[PDB]
Amino acid sequence: MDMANQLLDELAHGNFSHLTLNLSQNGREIAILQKQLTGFDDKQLETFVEQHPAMPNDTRFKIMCTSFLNYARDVDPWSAWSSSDLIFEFYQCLINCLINDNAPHIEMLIPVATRETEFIINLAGKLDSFHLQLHTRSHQFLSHISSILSRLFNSIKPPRGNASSTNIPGKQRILLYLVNKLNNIYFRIESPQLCSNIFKNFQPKSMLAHFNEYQLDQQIEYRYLLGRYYLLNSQVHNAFVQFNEAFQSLLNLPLTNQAITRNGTRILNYMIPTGLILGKMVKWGPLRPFLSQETIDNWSVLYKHVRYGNIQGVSLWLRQNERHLCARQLLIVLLEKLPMVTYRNLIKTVIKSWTTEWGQNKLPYSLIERVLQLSIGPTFEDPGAQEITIYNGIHSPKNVENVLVTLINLGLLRANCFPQLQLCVVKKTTMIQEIVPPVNERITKMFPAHSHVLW
Amino acid sequence: KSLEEDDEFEDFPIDTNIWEENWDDVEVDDDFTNELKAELDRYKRENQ
Amino acid sequence: DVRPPHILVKTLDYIVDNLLTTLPESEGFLWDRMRSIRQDFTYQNYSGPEAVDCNERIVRIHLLILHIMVKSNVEFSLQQELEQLHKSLITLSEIYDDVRSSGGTCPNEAEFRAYALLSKIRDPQYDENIQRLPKHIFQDKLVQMALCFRRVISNSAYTERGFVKTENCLNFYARFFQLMQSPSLPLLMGFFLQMHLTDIRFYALRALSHTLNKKHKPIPFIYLENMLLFNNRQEIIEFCNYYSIEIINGDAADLKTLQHYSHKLSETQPLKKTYLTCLERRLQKTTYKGLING
Numbered sequence: 001m002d003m004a005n006q007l008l009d010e011l012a013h014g015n016f017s018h019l020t021l022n023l024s025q026n027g028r029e030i031a032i033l034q035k036q037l038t039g040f041d042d043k044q045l046e047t048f049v050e051q052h053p054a055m056p057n058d059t060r061f062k063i064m065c066t067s068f069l070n071y072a073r074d075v076d077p078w079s080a081w082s083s084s085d086l087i088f089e090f091y092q093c094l095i096n097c098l099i100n101d102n103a104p105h106i107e108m109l110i111p112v113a114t115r116e117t118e119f120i121i122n123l124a125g126k127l128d129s130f131h132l133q134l135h136t137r138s139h140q141f142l143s144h145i146s147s148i149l150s151r152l153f154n155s156i157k158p159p160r161g162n163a164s165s166t167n168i169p170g171k172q173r174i175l176l177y178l179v180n181k182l183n184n185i186y187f188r189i190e191s192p193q194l195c196s197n198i199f200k201n202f203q204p205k206s207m208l209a210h211f212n213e214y215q216l217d218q219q220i221e222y223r224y225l226l227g228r229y230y231l232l233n234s235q236v237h238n239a240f241v242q243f244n245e246a247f248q249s250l251l252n253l254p255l256t257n258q259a260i261t262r263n264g265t266r267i268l269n270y271m272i273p274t275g276l277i278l279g280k281m282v283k284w285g286p287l288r289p290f291l292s293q294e295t296i297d298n299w300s301v302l303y304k305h306v307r308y309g310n311i312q313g314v315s316l317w318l319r320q321n322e323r324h325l326c327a328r329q330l331l332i333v334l335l336e337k338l339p340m341v342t343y344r345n346l347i348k349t350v351i352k353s354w355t356t357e358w359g360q361n362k363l364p365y366s367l368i369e370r371v372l373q374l375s376i377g378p379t380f381e382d383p384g385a386q387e388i389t390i391y392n393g394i395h396s397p398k399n400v401e402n403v404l405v406t407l408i409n410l411g412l413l414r415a416n417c418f419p420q421l422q423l424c425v426v427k428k429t430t431m432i433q434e435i436v437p438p439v440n441e442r443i444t445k446m447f448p449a450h451s452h453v454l455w
Numbered sequence: 456k457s458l459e460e461d462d463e464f465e466d467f468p469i470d471t472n473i474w475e476e477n478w479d480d481v482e483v484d485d486d487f488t489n490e491l492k493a494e495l496d497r498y499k500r501e502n503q
Numbered sequence: 504d505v506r507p508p509h510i511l512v513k514t515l516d517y518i519v520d521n522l523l524t525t526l527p528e529s530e531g532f533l534w535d536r537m538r539s540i541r542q543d544f545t546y547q548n549y550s551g552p553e554a555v556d557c558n559e560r561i562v563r564i565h566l567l568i569l570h571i572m573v574k575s576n577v578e579f580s581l582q583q584e585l586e587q588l589h590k591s592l593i594t595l596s597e598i599y600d601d602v603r604s605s606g607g608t609c610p611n612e613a614e615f616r617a618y619a620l621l622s623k624i625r626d627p628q629y630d631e632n633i634q635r636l637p638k639h640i641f642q643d644k645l646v647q648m649a650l651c652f653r654r655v656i657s658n659s660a661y662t663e664r665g666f667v668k669t670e671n672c673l674n675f676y677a678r679f680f681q682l683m684q685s686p687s688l689p690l691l692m693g694f695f696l697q698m699h700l701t702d703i704r705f706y707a708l709r710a711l712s713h714t715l716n717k718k719h720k721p722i723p724f725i726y727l728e729n730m731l732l733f734n735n736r737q738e739i740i741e742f743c744n745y746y747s748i749e750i751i752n753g754d755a756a757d758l759k760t761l762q763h764y765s766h767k768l769s770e771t772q773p774l775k776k777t778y779l780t781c782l783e784r785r786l787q788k789t790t791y792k793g794l795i796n797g
Binding site: 254364 | 463465472479491
Binding site: 131132137138190192193232233234235236237277278323326329331332335336337338339340341380387388389390393394395396398399401402404405406408409410415416417418419420425443446447 | 600601604605606627628630631634635638641644647648650651654655657659660667668669670671672673674675676677678681682685687710711713714715716719720722723726
């Protein structure tokens with residue numbers, strides 16, 4: 001039996017059971033098709049699609065079918081590179097069949113498009129790893145995929161304000177799926193700022209009235225990627241609400257797979273430092289199934305150093321953890337934003353005994369300079385470390401007034417400064433929270449994040 | 456190995472208070488806090 | 504009509520050897536001609552070693568011009584200089600990416616990754632880019648220095664139309680002026696950092712003013728001059744006059760009278776760029792050509 005004619009019947013009637021680039025699912029049928037299609041030139045295949053009965057009178061659809069016939073005819077299963085032109089060509093045609101909202105067999109083509117999207121993403125990574133041997137630039141294949149998915153994303157239109165049906169068109173069903181796929185691509189090619197447009201046009205294109213109406217897994221991944229983006233722009237609160245809601249939503253999911261536990265671990269790897277910057281420390285109870293004991297010990301060491309005002313402790317912890325923190329884009333933001341919390345707790349313990357217990361309303365700069373001598377420890381000026389480092393070049397016990405001034409400007413210390421008296425006056429009181437308020441409330445009030453529930 | 460260590464979420468077939476209320480009030484004597492308190496006592500004593 | 508790479512190298516050699524010391528008078532000539540060299544590289548789609556060398560030394564010449572034009576009172580506005588310097592740093596970054604992708608290396612890459620980190624000192628994009636580079640580039644003393652400057656310059660109260668404030672920034676002005684005096688600071692890098700003296704000083708005085716009570720006395724000019732490393736008194740007087748900080752007793756600044764919350768005043772032009780006496784003194788102790796050749 002003519003298997004090309006048969007396949008063209010199936011494709012002409014929206015039966016895409018054999019329309020796939022995955023030879024692990026299509027191998028035998030594609031082999032038969034390859035033996036039967038050998039002989040025919042490109043124009044003969046194009047004619048096979050053009051003159052086929054019941055074939056939709058769509059140029060892009062017929063281009064897709066012809067491209068799949070070229071693939072099946074010329075595919076070399078022994079060489080992923082030699083067959084890559086056919087594979088990527090057919091993928092681009094397939095996505096082209098989705099740009100028109102009223103394209104033929106659009107609803108049947110969408111699942112095919114998602115399937116082939118996962119396949120072509122895997123193959124695109126595989127081929128990008130050999131960019132030197134293939135004479136291609138870095139991430140060229142996957143970036144091409146990102147362009148295709150970007151045009152598909154632009155083609156998705158918002159709902160009509162007075163729509164006549166509640167039909168969720170399949171282009172809307174995969175909207176968040178496409179957003180997370182595209183943003184993940186932008187993260188893997190190491191150009192995550194390209195997510196910006198994708199994040200800006202997501203909600204305007206969505207027909208769903210609430211963000212919680214998408215699949216909760218896609219919600220979790222979206223909050224994860226959005227939080228990582230925010231954190232890439234050093235917006236710690238905006239990232240924090242996204243990581244937090246992501247991990248809560250993950251706690252609601254039934255723990256079916258190990259990959260869900262590892263995804264929760266991926267969320268925590270960012271939620272713990274982001275929270276710590278905002279003065280929040282986790283309770284390890286609900287985090288036992290997602291974190292090893294050694295990770296908990298590490299973050300607990302950092303927790304002690306920040307909690308009791310040990311700047312040298314914090315810088316030492318960042319120094320020992322430098323590599324993996326740089327891998328997750330975490331070192332710079334912690335190096336910059338953990339110090340003010342650590343200082344806050346340092347002068348918190350100082351003002352506690354000095355003011356609430358010993359009844360001294362004044363904080364001389366010499367006292368805070370000795371305290372900073374204990375907390376900071378060595379600096380670039382000091383001997384034994386004659387080369388400047390991010391861990392010894394920033395913090396110096398000489399800059400008492402600067403630390404106090406930043407603490408007061410961040411709202412972490414309610415006090416007045418006297419530079420010519422060289423002292424810092426707090427309010428005479430026994431309650432320490434009146435002088436040093438809760439840090440998370442102050443930070444979140446000064447930096448109000450966007451709505452944690454998107455919409 | 457790369458699927459488990461990479462930051463990108465893994466694919467899986469689809470089918471609470473976790474933060475400290477306040478760590479300022481729950482105070483625990485720390486080693487560093489002990490040396491800091493001792494430094495506060497020595498400074499309080501040299502500056503009588 | 505266009506120079507091949509080796510005569511572009513010959514031409515930049517001619518400039519480094521003959522026309523550096525004609526500055527500041529030859530600033531427009533040199534800027535235009537260097538831009539012409541880079542443009543000749545783009546005409547031939549050439550990112551080879553000659554394009555790297557030329558863009559590198561041209562970046563260094565831009566850095567020297569930044570200090571020379573400001574030490575004198577010739578130009579005041581360095582918009583075009585900073586624009587072409589930035590575009591040259593972008594070219595160098597792209598070429599470094601292509602060379603790394605091809606398995607090669609560039610010996611001066613770290614230096615100009617640092618300069619690139621100083622081109623847009625408050626753009627998180629360059630932190631993002633610097634964190635994915637190799638460890639020998641990231642841990643290089645020059646990149647470490649530029650990173651330290653980016654940390655101490657960060658300010659949660661930095662105000663400018665289109666700039667989103669970030670949390671828990673340091674605003675370590677004192678540490679900034681400590682590092683600017685370091686003899687380990689490369690001179691051209693210092694020249695690049697002198698572009699932010701006015702901003703850093705403004706936000707220093709703002710942040711300090713928020714900590715003073717209402718009836719606090721004006722801050723003496725001596726304290727603010729040692730704290731902000733002003734070259735002389737006329738500079739801090741012109742600084743206070745620019746930002747409408749009332750000068751009491753002709754030697755004190757009443758910081759509560761500072762009503763501005765942004766370094767950039769809405770209607771008037773920015774205060775003219777300034778320099779540090781230590782860096783000029785260091786410049787008089789070396790040669791222009793020496794600095795440009797590394």
